[PDB]
Amino acid sequence: GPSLDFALSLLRRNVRQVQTDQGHFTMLGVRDRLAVLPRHSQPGKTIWIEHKLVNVLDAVELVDEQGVNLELTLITLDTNEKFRDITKFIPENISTASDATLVINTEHMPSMFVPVGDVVQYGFLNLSGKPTGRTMMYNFPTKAGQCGGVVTSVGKIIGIHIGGNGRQGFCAGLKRSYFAS
Ligand SMILES: C=CC(=O)N(C)Cc1nc(C(F)(F)F)cs1
Numbered sequence: 001g002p003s004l005d006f007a008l009s010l011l012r013r014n015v016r017q018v019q020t021d022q023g024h025f026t027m028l029g030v031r032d033r034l035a036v037l038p039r040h041s042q043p044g045k046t047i048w049i050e051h052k053l054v055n056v057l058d059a060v061e062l063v064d065e066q067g068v069n070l071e072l073t074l075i076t077l078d079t080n081e082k083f084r085d086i087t088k089f090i091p092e093n094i095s096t097a098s099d100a101t102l103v104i105n106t107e108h109m110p111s112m113f114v115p116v117g118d119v120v121q122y123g124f125l126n127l128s129g130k131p132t133g134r135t136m137m138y139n140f141p142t143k144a145g146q147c148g149g150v151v152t153s154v155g156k157i158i159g160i161h162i163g164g165n166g167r168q169g170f171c172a173g174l175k176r177s178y179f180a181s
Helices: 002-014
Strands: 015-020 023-031 034-038 046-049 052-063 069-077 097-104 112-127 130-139 150-153 156-164 168-173
Touching (some): 002 097, 002 150, 023 156, 034 156, 069 156, 097 156, 112 150, 112 168, 130 156
Parallel strands (some): 069 130
Antiparallel strands (some): 015 023, 015 046, 023 034, 034 069, 052 069, 112 130, 130 168, 156 168
8 A cells, every 4th residue: 555655666666686796685875975884794995786786985884882883884875876765765763663674685586575563772782792772572483584674664764684583673763864964
């Protein structure tokens, strides 16, 4: 319905398949040449995007005001093309949701929509040994959720999927200010 309408349009214009030395990832293009990945993707000076070799001009691993990992990396891409600006769909404060859909798009798992349901505040999480902040939690029963993914609800882009415990999945929450200016 309306939730999936928004998720499909987001896929089309803003969710891309990428590959780093660490594997296959879902990338969210945010605006202009700015995109976001889960930190574990560890982008290098070049990245493969939809089968094309692209230079990474800048990469920033985001931390909070204590320097605690947020498990998000912002990259600026060496390209002329511009992503549709979706920042107005990213809430000012990290937001929970009902009836959320996780959008995964990699070469090996293309255009995959997973109903996850309720997305609940969780906060501090030790993610494979790395203390992490600002997480949310949802049902996601896989041990292979290591490719990122965009958490969406009706008209809102709320998180980047970062990992899980085989029963629940966890996202880094998105706030508009991470992408400002
Ligand atoms: C790293 C991509 C990812 O997230 N993987 C492989 C876990 C998932 N598996 C499914 C399936 F095929 F069981 F439905 C949906 S997401």
